[PDB]
Amino acid sequence: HHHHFNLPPGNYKKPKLLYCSNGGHFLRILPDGTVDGTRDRSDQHIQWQLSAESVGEVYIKSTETGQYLAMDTDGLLYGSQTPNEECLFLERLEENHYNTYISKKHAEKNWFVGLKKNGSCKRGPRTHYGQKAILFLPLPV
Numbered sequence: 566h567h568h569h570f571n572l573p574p575g576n577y578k579k580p581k582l583l584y585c586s587n588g589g590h591f592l593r594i595l596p597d598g599t600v601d602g603t604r605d606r607s608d609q610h611i612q613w614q615l616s617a618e619s620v621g622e623v624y625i626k627s628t629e630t631g632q633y634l635a636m637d638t639d640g641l642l643y644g645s646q647t648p649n650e651e652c653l654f655l656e657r658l659e660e661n662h663y664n665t666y667i668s669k670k671h672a673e674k675n676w677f678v679g680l681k682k683n684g685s686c687k688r689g690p691r692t693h694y695g696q697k698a699i700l701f702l703p704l705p706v
Contacts, residue, residue: 567672567673568655568657568667568672569657570621570657571657571658571659571661572620572621572656572657572658573656573657573658573664573703574658575703577614577615577616577617577623579705579706580612580613580614580628580706581612581613581614581615581703581704581705581706582606582611582612582613582703582704582705582706583611583613583625583701583702583703583704584701584702584703584704585602585679585680585698585700585701585702586663586697586700586701586702587679587680587681587682587696587697587698587700588602588604588680588681588682588683588684589604590602590603590604590680590684591603591604591605591606591608591611592611592613592634592678592680592701593608593610593611594610594627594630594632594634594644595610595630596610596629596630596632598632598643598644599644600634600642600643600644600686601680601684601685601686602680602684602685602686603684604684609629610627610629610630612627612628612629612706613625613626613627613628613634614626614628615656615703618653621655621656621657622653622654622655622656622669623653623654623656623666624648624652624653624654625652625654625666625678627644630644631646632644632645632646633645633646633647633648633652634652634654634678635649635651635652636651636668636670636671636676636678636689637651638651639688639689640668640671640676640688640689640690640691641686641688641689642678642686650669650670651668651670653668653669653670654666654667654668654669654678655667655668655669655672659699659700660700663700663701663702664700664701664702664703665677665678665699665700665701666678666699666701668689671689674689674690675692675693675694676689676690676692677689677692677693677696677698677699678692678699678701679691679692679696679698679699680698681698682698687699
């Protein structure tokens, strides 16, 4: 393993909103695959269903569009129609409270899912332990 194994105390029984404390944005993915963050809780593209493939390994899927959140070879988040190795994330507890998501594919480089204060997604190499951009709080829908 290249990462710790502190896991968040929760399940995948129901869909969730992925709230980012950094700028207070909900993770969003449009039908065309555009990924970003919005503070509009009425938005119809911020609902996600997570599922575990292995303990601590999750798929993060848009309930509205059916797309899987994924990070590409350049560290850009995108929406994949079908599950692939770029769609798996290591879901972990952080600062004993939040959830972080590390790209399994690029785990050795510590590339995380993250949102800047202006609501734009961070590129993998620009993320790292210690940022508020990578801290999420799963909220009920």
